[PDB]
Enzyme design. Structure first.
Site, PDB file in Angstrom:
ATOM      1  N   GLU A   1      28.043  29.512 -25.826  1.00 53.96           N
ATOM      2  CA  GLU A   1      28.983  29.361 -24.690  1.00 53.96           C
ATOM      3  C   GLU A   1      30.093  28.499 -24.825  1.00 53.96           C
ATOM      4  OE1 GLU A   1      28.582  28.327 -20.275  1.00 53.96           O
ATOM      5  OE2 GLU A   1      28.415  30.580 -20.303  1.00 53.96           O
TER       6      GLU A   1
ATOM      7  N   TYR B   1      32.485  28.488 -14.353  1.00 50.96           N
ATOM      8  CA  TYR B   1      32.083  27.165 -14.720  1.00 50.96           C
ATOM      9  C   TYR B   1      30.628  27.259 -14.701  1.00 50.96           C
ATOM     10  CZ  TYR B   1      36.526  25.604 -13.368  1.00 50.96           C
ATOM     11  OH  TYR B   1      37.821  25.366 -13.335  1.00 50.96           O
ATOM     12  N   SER B   2      30.050  26.622 -15.719  1.00 56.16           N
ATOM     13  CA  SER B   2      28.562  26.861 -16.137  1.00 56.16           C
ATOM     14  C   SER B   2      27.995  26.168 -14.890  1.00 56.16           C
ATOM     15  CB  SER B   2      28.298  26.106 -17.232  1.00 56.16           C
ATOM     16  OG  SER B   2      29.048  26.357 -18.585  1.00 56.16           O
TER      17      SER B   2
ATOM     18  N   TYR C   1      34.217  27.453 -24.749  1.00 57.30           N
ATOM     19  CA  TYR C   1      35.674  27.852 -23.978  1.00 57.30           C
ATOM     20  C   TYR C   1      36.652  26.873 -24.106  1.00 57.30           C
ATOM     21  CZ  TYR C   1      32.890  24.547 -21.031  1.00 57.30           C
ATOM     22  OH  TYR C   1      32.088  23.472 -20.826  1.00 57.30           O
TER      23      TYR C   1
HETATM   24  C1  LIG Z   1      31.729  30.668 -19.320  1.00 58.17           C
HETATM   25  C2  LIG Z   1      32.455  29.423 -19.171  1.00 58.17           C
HETATM   26  C3  LIG Z   1      31.802  28.319 -18.683  1.00 58.17           C
HETATM   27  C4  LIG Z   1      32.721  27.105 -18.491  1.00 58.17           C
HETATM   28  N1  LIG Z   1      32.287  26.067 -17.832  1.00 58.17           N
HETATM   29  C5  LIG Z   1      32.818  25.096 -17.534  1.00 58.17           C
HETATM   30  C6  LIG Z   1      32.387  23.773 -17.065  1.00 58.17           C
HETATM   31  O1  LIG Z   1      30.957  23.692 -17.021  1.00 58.17           O
HETATM   32  N2  LIG Z   1      33.101  22.656 -16.683  1.00 58.17           N
HETATM   33  C7  LIG Z   1      34.668  22.772 -16.870  1.00 58.17           C
HETATM   34  O2  LIG Z   1      35.178  21.848 -16.512  1.00 58.17           O
HETATM   35  N3  LIG Z   1      35.148  23.934 -17.332  1.00 58.17           N
HETATM   36  C8  LIG Z   1      34.349  25.217 -17.764  1.00 58.17           C
HETATM   37  N4  LIG Z   1      34.848  25.954 -18.268  1.00 58.17           N
HETATM   38  C9  LIG Z   1      36.322  26.332 -18.207  1.00 58.17           C
HETATM   39  C10 LIG Z   1      36.917  26.747 -16.876  1.00 58.17           C
HETATM   40  O3  LIG Z   1      36.573  27.984 -16.580  1.00 58.17           O
HETATM   41  C11 LIG Z   1      38.588  26.567 -16.816  1.00 58.17           C
HETATM   42  O4  LIG Z   1      39.146  27.222 -17.677  1.00 58.17           O
HETATM   43  C12 LIG Z   1      38.965  25.065 -16.909  1.00 58.17           C
HETATM   44  O5  LIG Z   1      38.672  24.494 -15.735  1.00 58.17           O
HETATM   45  C13 LIG Z   1      40.719  24.852 -16.853  1.00 58.17           C
HETATM   46  O6  LIG Z   1      40.897  25.819 -15.740  1.00 58.17           O
HETATM   47  P1  LIG Z   1      42.226  25.096 -14.694  1.00 58.17           P
HETATM   48  O7  LIG Z   1      42.267  26.429 -13.831  1.00 58.17           O
HETATM   49  O8  LIG Z   1      41.991  24.054 -14.343  1.00 58.17           O
HETATM   50  O9  LIG Z   1      43.445  25.533 -15.913  1.00 58.17           O
HETATM   51  P2  LIG Z   1      44.567  26.660 -15.934  1.00 58.17           P
HETATM   52  O10 LIG Z   1      45.327  26.206 -14.812  1.00 58.17           O
HETATM   53  O11 LIG Z   1      43.930  27.841 -15.870  1.00 58.17           O
HETATM   54  O12 LIG Z   1      45.078  26.282 -17.197  1.00 58.17           O
HETATM   55  C14 LIG Z   1      44.657  26.668 -18.472  1.00 58.17           C
HETATM   56  C15 LIG Z   1      45.784  26.885 -19.537  1.00 58.17           C
HETATM   57  O13 LIG Z   1      45.968  25.432 -20.111  1.00 58.17           O
HETATM   58  C16 LIG Z   1      47.048  25.907 -21.228  1.00 58.17           C
HETATM   59  N5  LIG Z   1      46.988  24.769 -22.135  1.00 58.17           N
HETATM   60  C17 LIG Z   1      48.010  24.517 -23.023  1.00 58.17           C
HETATM   61  N6  LIG Z   1      47.880  23.222 -23.765  1.00 58.17           N
HETATM   62  C18 LIG Z   1      46.621  23.048 -23.423  1.00 58.17           C
HETATM   63  C19 LIG Z   1      45.667  22.349 -24.051  1.00 58.17           C
HETATM   64  N7  LIG Z   1      46.136  21.271 -24.949  1.00 58.17           N
HETATM   65  N8  LIG Z   1      44.466  22.105 -23.753  1.00 58.17           N
HETATM   66  C20 LIG Z   1      43.748  22.909 -22.917  1.00 58.17           C
HETATM   67  N9  LIG Z   1      44.595  23.812 -21.910  1.00 58.17           N
HETATM   68  C21 LIG Z   1      46.078  23.653 -22.606  1.00 58.17           C
HETATM   69  C22 LIG Z   1      46.238  27.218 -21.591  1.00 58.17           C
HETATM   70  O14 LIG Z   1      47.543  27.952 -21.415  1.00 58.17           O
HETATM   71  C23 LIG Z   1      45.463  27.582 -20.849  1.00 58.17           C
HETATM   72  O15 LIG Z   1      45.212  28.965 -20.441  1.00 58.17           O
HETATM   73  C24 LIG Z   1      34.238  27.178 -18.558  1.00 58.17           C
HETATM   74  C25 LIG Z   1      34.631  28.521 -19.013  1.00 58.17           C
HETATM   75  C26 LIG Z   1      33.961  29.599 -19.288  1.00 58.17           C
HETATM   76  C27 LIG Z   1      34.836  30.773 -19.787  1.00 58.17           C
END
Ligand SMILES: Cc1cc2nc3c(=O)[nH]c(=O)nc-3n(C[C@H](O)[C@H](O)[C@H](O)COP(=O)(O)OP(=O)(O)OC[C@H]3O[C@@H](n4cnc5c(N)ncnc54)[C@H](O)[C@@H]3O)c2cc1C
Length: 295
Positions: free
Chosen positions: A293, A71-72, A295
């Site tokens: 950046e 997360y940024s 994602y």
């Molecule tokens: C450098 C960086 C900075 C980031 N900054 C932020 C930030 O500031 N704030 C923020 O909220 N997030 C940010 N993110 C994204 C964050 O890291 C997570 O990926 C995001 O919060 C979702 O993770 P989760 O564990 O909730 O979802 P997970 O349980 O990991 O599920 C993600 C999975 O959803 C699946 N998926 C299927 N359909 C869809 C769809 N239609 N849309 C999306 N996903 C789908 C994909 O398989 C994906 O891998 C950043 C990511 C990076 C790499």
């Protein structure tokens, strides 16, 4: 000099949630929370534009421990209270549906974070990232092209630049350049940090310009919903003119997908002066003045 990997996922910092506050106002789409963590009792330091990892609890569908999500960082190095004791995140609850299979699926780490209660212990890693750093130069120009939670690094820059308490705490950085945030969200209630962003623009009208692309409330000249790419097209010449300054940095942050339209718009602007944007951009990236950046 830049702090990096002071904590790693094998031995994360255990921070405590101080506050978890909603950024999406009534009538907005989705859930985005401003979450502040206590860093006292460890030595996690960080600078603006960096990220941290959060390791959510639990196991995935395969029974494997969940890995970190990045997360940024949304606070300056000093934290929101300018006390060097905290770190903040700007976290959108990820949700999407079916079929597919569901209906609504909730992202593991983002749901955990968005519903986290003050006092909860959180596994934090990092900081990481050297691609979204703000220049030390107080006369730099800073173009910020953000969608949704992509606002996060932009808040770290703008707070450092423009918060009274930041200015007081950073004698070496009294920002006198020009900053321009173009911020795409679907609704006015979705304008994350709206009040503070607008306070900054009112206080620093010559040093900060705020432009919104609000998809549900505005149409582009083609009658389509207004997106960040449309505002960049609309201001392509101005943006290009700023970009030509040796001191200008551009930051793009958000969910993937906005780069293409941004490039098209700047490409057309630069072509007018016989410049191939994609080449000039390669040079900007190499110089560390084109920061992306997504994602
Ligand atoms: C450098 C960086 C900075 C980031 N900054 C932020 C930030 O500031 N704030 C923020 O909220 N997030 C940010 N993110 C994204 C964050 O890291 C997570 O990926 C995001 O919060 C979702 O993770 P989760 O564990 O909730 O979802 P997970 O349980 O990991 O599920 C993600 C999975 O959803 C699946 N998926 C299927 N359909 C869809 C769809 N239609 N849309 C999306 N996903 C789908 C994909 O398989 C994906 O891998 C950043 C990511 C990076 C790499």
């Amino acid at each position: 000099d830049v702090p990096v990997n002071l904590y790693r996922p094998n031995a994360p910092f255990i921070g405590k949630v101080i506050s978890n506050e909603p950024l999406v106002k009534e009538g907005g789409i989705g859930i985005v929370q401003h979450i502040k963590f206590d860093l006292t009792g460890g030595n996690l330091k960080y600078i603006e534009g960096q990220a941290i990892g959060i390791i959510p609890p639990g196991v995935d569908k395969n029974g494997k421990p969940e890995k970190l999500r990045l997360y940024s960082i949304a606070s300056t190095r000093h934290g929101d209270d300018v006390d060097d004791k905290t770190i903040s995140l700007c976290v959108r609850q990820l949700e999407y549906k079916h079929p597919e299979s569901g209906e609504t699926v909730y992202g593991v780490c983002s749901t955990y974070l968005t519903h986290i209660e003050p006092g909860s212990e959180v596994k934090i890693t990092g900081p990481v990232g050297k691609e979204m750093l703000l220049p030390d130069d107080p006369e730099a120009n800073v173009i910020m092209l953000a969608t949704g939670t992509g606002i996060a690094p932009m808040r770290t820059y703008l707070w450092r630049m423009f918060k009274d308490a930041e200015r007081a705490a950073n004698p070496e950085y009294q920002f006198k350049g020009f900053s321009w945030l173009v911020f795409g969200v679907p609704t006015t209630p979705n304008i994350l940090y709206k009040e503070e962003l607008e306070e900054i623009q009112q206080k620093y009208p010559d040093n900060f310009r705020l432009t919104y692309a609000i998809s549900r409330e505005q149409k582009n000249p083609q009658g389509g919903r207004m997106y960040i790419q449309d505002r960049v097209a609309e201001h392509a010449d101005e943006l290009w003119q700023l970009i030509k300054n040796q001191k200008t940095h551009t930051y793009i942050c958000g969910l993937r997908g906005m780069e293409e339209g941004i490039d098209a718009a700047l490409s057309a602007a630069a072509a007018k002066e016989g410049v191939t944007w994609s080449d000039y951009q390669k040079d900007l990236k190499k110089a560390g003045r084109w920061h992306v950046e997504t994602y």
